[PDB]
């Protein structure tokens, strides 16, 4: 009842030492579809789920291409995702044009965090309402990162964000001890099994609502969609129940 | 344990407690005061059908230009606040002409789409636009169709219906549409959808069509061609 | 044209850049930040651009309140010989033109 | 201060600015960090609450390296702390370029404290919600420890504690007589204080984080080796 | 920007029906938030400043707590009020002195520095975006032609020159004491000035002082450089009072 | 209410309340009168600055000369009127410099009314609380008389009044004005009568006239002796009329 | 009621600006000031605010010179007075540089009032809470002007402002005479100041300045003591 | 209409009625909560109207496991028959063009029941104070002409301040809600009435409620005079919202 | 409660400030425009006439160029500003390129200028509506209308201002191809349409006429009264 005066702007502190607009912007991530990321000793994989809307009126691109060794997936507002993708592409292009060397993923994520911290302290702006999962390969190996509207980032072994992603997170933490020794096929199957845990217990994954993105030591970032996904979905078994 | 008022829908930079921006949603709801438009994507071409409403018989039925055509083999259609599309059209035309003057070929539909989408996102003008667009054209990739809403972002599609009565038009178009059809079949489908959506007659002075296909350039149907159907 | 045209056009900007660089090197990043905040705040309360302003607060902050130069006695801007339409000048100030 | 607490350019009828007070209250929402100055170095200690098992070990660290010779421990809002760490790195690099030798800790503390204070004067910006501590060692100057709060005030300390349980930590620190001890003797005391301050009913699990800078590392900031940290953790656990 | 707040005492640029600026009056009350008081006294050929030093924490390094600052080689300062605001004003005063030296070729005088600071403070009370600092400055120095100088400026933008002045929690009693002493006697030697300042502090605050609880700075005609005394000298003066 | 705090707000019935409130500030000012005749124009004003300890060091108050052919009178806020008069002089001089011909009377009024309208168009500023009367001569239309208001509107008149008690003066002028058959003497007598009714001594009025002589415009301010002569003539004719 | 009292750019429904009235109220609560224009001279007098023995007697003054033939005094707030004085001095120097002759008093008053009119028509600032009395000698003829916080100026023969200025103006009306000398003007100004001092008047708590054909100058305390003894 | 909880309405004759107003900061409503909780009153009926937005919830004064499951509505009446005290509480806000009918209906019921006097707790905006009000106490009072002489004698003894009039003279209470309408109707219908308000600003307004309740106790003497004494209701928790999300601090 | 700011949408998608500007337009004097085979006619009601006023300075019909003229309804100062801007634009365009200005081009310029002022919260829209007629280079008559929001259309006959709906209904009933055959019939149609709302015909009616390759002509009261007399005579004949 006493929060009405302190939750309209990002530049107002609450008497309890809180900023409610950042916490509200953190709720916009749960309005998107679920997505899962996981990694092994050699490869990093992203899988995404598309809305049940008919493909007739929409061609959604949840997984985007950033560089030859970096790819992302989105959950949240779309304009902010577009702006962040443009910024990342420009950074990678400038780095490559100046020095003939790939830009490290950790440096890229640090730049992203520094950029997104600014609109949380200045009047007349609002935080970015989008969360990202980032997969890449560099001299240190494969990496998975997570990004938050509060300008925080984490280094993960496996993560899931979106709507009803708690089931996927539970599955990932239950089966997380076997990911390092698996090959590409087993890794993708584990990702698909984690992703399908967020659906009601009568639907199943089809070749119309699933996207896959893979990067590796010798494999550039590639996106599999529509009919290219069937060789990955064919080996998956039926539901336990 | 008392009931109090609280508002979150007066500024474009305010988040709701459940992570919603209400001003953008209201701007999107403003589209449903416009006229219905139809777009269909076919391997042979793209057909744009738009609705023209006349308030009085004394109005000249020629100044209601809803299908504006940009160069580089590109169509357009509109619904909502017509006065708000002029800046977008000017930006698209300037970008295309600069591309001609610097490279001497045609800019792609996706590229002009992205370029015009950059300008619609600058409200974060201090308010979102109140208009929706539909783009058509063919390139080396073939025919393409795109849609934009006042949120400021585009999305590729192949059969979309926008306007005041759009849900029923989309439901009918989903059934009628097939993966393969002829351009004339698509035109007939658009015409019948417009017929069963309109509340009035369909003489050659109520609609406006401009079917584009890789054979020749822009071709907006004349009065005689429209009256033929 | 004359070598002195560009120098006289942008004297204040170059002076500001020099002083800000020296201040940053000696004290730190906060001092030019504060100075720019103050300048922006005081440069926001003025007449509409087709009338003549005084800039009293800006002169006090910048230190130009006990100095007279050749830009204060030659070609007085208050008695200008050309002036545009009011709405056009206000629109040009806001960037719409 | 109802009616006078919506902007940082407003005074209350008794001469207070309540936005800065709320920003300082925001620092008690995070976990406790302590730092103890010794006869030949400085030791840092942070209890890091683990949120999930899916995060890599060494993620979301709260101990930084703003240079080769300076360590930094933070508490409060994390993004603000990272921005302040970047500012400190820029200032140290600029001083090194201009003068050709390492910046003293006092000058760095002043240059960062003034930057923090500059954000408490205008209504167009917001004060920082974080605190941090700086530590260093040099043969010419000895050990040094500083602490900065959101209002922009910095002081030198012999022992400091920030976070949600700083009062109990200070009470425990005040019974050590650290002016004659050694770093290896104080690592154990820091671990013991961290373990005795932690509360298990509300917070489930935490991971202890330690580091020093001192004579034994030639004046470099480093993480404590695994064996010493394990021995200190065992000592603290059996002392509980 | 954000937008002003309605009310006769909630914005800097709003007059009350009696023509008062309550935000300036409230900024005057922030000077007492520290809890300390300081005294400055001018002599025949010297000027001194004395302030009390409170160190409540055992774990705090006492060498880093001070309120005496050096602006130039020949100008000293004492600040009362909010600590960060005081330090920011010290930095600004140093910058202004550097500008004056560069522009005119000789070192700035005390009255000119005080006037410049007061001019800068006046602007904050007439614009809606910036706020006054809750602190007051007292400066001392030796003039080549005039002699010792004591000056003071306040958050409103007002400055003046004095023979003796005080600031802080107990300014009024100190002012009364100094007024009585000045009406009684003039022409104090260097010793008598420090005696008078310490006596004023120790009488207004009913405390017997230790050398670690006060802080003394001095300037004199023979040695015009600003100097900060040590504990041995302070204790020598204290036993001189005690005998 | 909720629609009268800014100049950039329309009420639900399409009204701008701040502009009307600004125009409300003119009813407290002194009375100004203007009359057009066949061989001249007239301007009569009421002196509010009346006091024993006041000095007289100026050409006149509330009557200003804009160029060789025009003059004005003001009612409202003095500090705003000063700015407006300075701007009028600048505009006239600029036109003369550019075209090498004197500015027409209507173009000056239009140019000032544009400035007055901009301050109601743009936000964060306050409209001018000033109303003006203009007289002049030019080769296109001869003698002229205009009026202006804080909103930026203007129009041409043959006799008008602004300031305190304007409605009664307008009614009297409507009753007593003869179109096309009045001279400067008749205009002076009518002005004296109307001012006497609406408000008499020679120290409370100021009168200025405009006329053409040998292809040159002459602008004069009447003297105390002439004002007293007019007042006493009006008094004697009134007494003679009421004696019958 | 109070909706139109806080904003400077808002008209009242009766067509009034209230913040300007409140600035004038700020002026009316200041220290008294008196100005008298006699034959062959003008006199300005005021009451000091630093009434103590600790205050230095040569640091800050309330009567200031602008040019060799123009002086100034005020009632209200001192910090605004300082910046206005600096701007006036700069304007006078600019006029001399352009026209090669000293500025007339009326032109300087007009320029200062133009500077003061701004800050009453914009949002984000407040008006100056001060009034000025300006005296000068020009073309063998003395002058005396007053300028308001709103930017309006008047020409006076004798006036008072500050605390208890209505009774002071009544006293001046009773006492002022056309054929007066400068010495008698100084006597009358001191007598007018004495009507509301509420204390003992000495030469250390009043300030006097005069203007004649030799220029503007500020009287020394010994001259003020000699004048006071003659009462 | 007063609909009783049981079958027959209670007999109220000579009772003193206490009631809040829906004003700035909810100060009167919070004070009513404090009084009802401390004196431990009992519900006797409802005041069913068409003027307030409807709301519902469980018992706001639960102490045991049995009385914690009693439904509550937006307007309820509590009584203390031992000391002849009756209190009304409103838990919601008013719909447009509905305040005057509510005041008319309430005063009609008050007149028909047979109560002695009425006391109203309200509040007013704190940013509309002048210089003289800025340096005085924030508590004001009003009284109808019909009030008994003993009340005026006691109030004069208590050294209180009366609410200032505004420029035929009228009273204006900015931010007071229905207080002005209630006062005017009570004056026109010859009912004894007292108004007790405070100048407040919106935020956390619990100290304001404590001050107002002590101010009222200075006259009523509901409990022991001042020389942990008011019971905080169990519903006064989570007044700022839910908990703090993780991975932020 | 969504009508306090210019750039704020209502829950059902409305901008209320622009509609309030339209309301301000709806209170001006009625204006009527009719285009024929070789002539265009404009007519404006005169609300009131003061005897001591010069009527030349309060006309509501202006000439933007040699082949275009305009009438308006709404606020007068805004109309004057718009007229001056359009005139300057026509002069500049004619100087730059010798081709005559197109009526659609000038209409688009005016509409763009009007639409610019509905985009920011720091300025207010123009409360006027305009009727524009003229002849193109090939002699084709045109008629356009503009709105405060920035839209425009093309008509054959339209009315704006107070009491416009009845005039529009009358025009819809009476606008035929045999009623615009001749200039006199077109002028009679305009006068008859205006006579539906005007209390006394001729006394307070202003009318303008424009023919091909001719300057704008303002009809005098003698001609207006002659036309009114002809209308009265034909009405008397048709009475029976």
Residue numbers in the entry:
A (entry chain E): 1 to 241
B (entry chain D): 1 to 124, 133 to 237
C (entry chain H): 45 to 141
D (entry chain F): 5 to 244
E (entry chain G): 2 to 244
F (entry chain B): 3 to 201, 206 to 250
G (entry chain A): 3 to 233
H (entry chain J): 1 to 167, 176 to 235, 243 to 264
Paper text:
Structure 2 is distinguished by the loss of PAC3/PAC4 and addition of β3, and it explains previous observations from genetically engineered mammalian cells that β3 is the second β subunit to enter and this requires prior β2 addition. The β2 subunit grasps β3 with both a C-terminal extension (CTE) and the β2 propeptide, rationalizing why β3 incorporation in mammalian cells requires these β2 elements. Residues 114–141 directly clamp β3 against the α-ring through an interaction that is also buttressed by part of the β2 propeptide (bottom). Notably, the regions of the β2 propeptide and POMP that clamp β3 in place bind the same α3 and α4 surfaces as PAC3/PAC4 did in structure 1 (zoomed-out views). This suggests that PAC3/PAC4 eviction may coincide with the stabilization of those regions of POMP and the β2 propeptide upon incorporation of β3. Upon departure of PAC3/PAC4, α-ring stability may be alternatively supported by POMP bridging β2–β3 and the α-ring, as well as changes at the α-ring pore. PAC1’s N terminus runs alongside α1’s N terminus through the center of the α-ring until PAC1 contacts a newly ordered region of POMP and makes a U-turn to terminate in the center of the α-ring pore.
The CP is composed of four stacked α-rings and β-rings, each containing seven distinct α or β subunits. Previous work identified five CP chaperones: proteasome maturation protein (POMP, also called hUmp1)29–34 and proteasome assembly chaperones 1–4 (PAC1–PAC4).
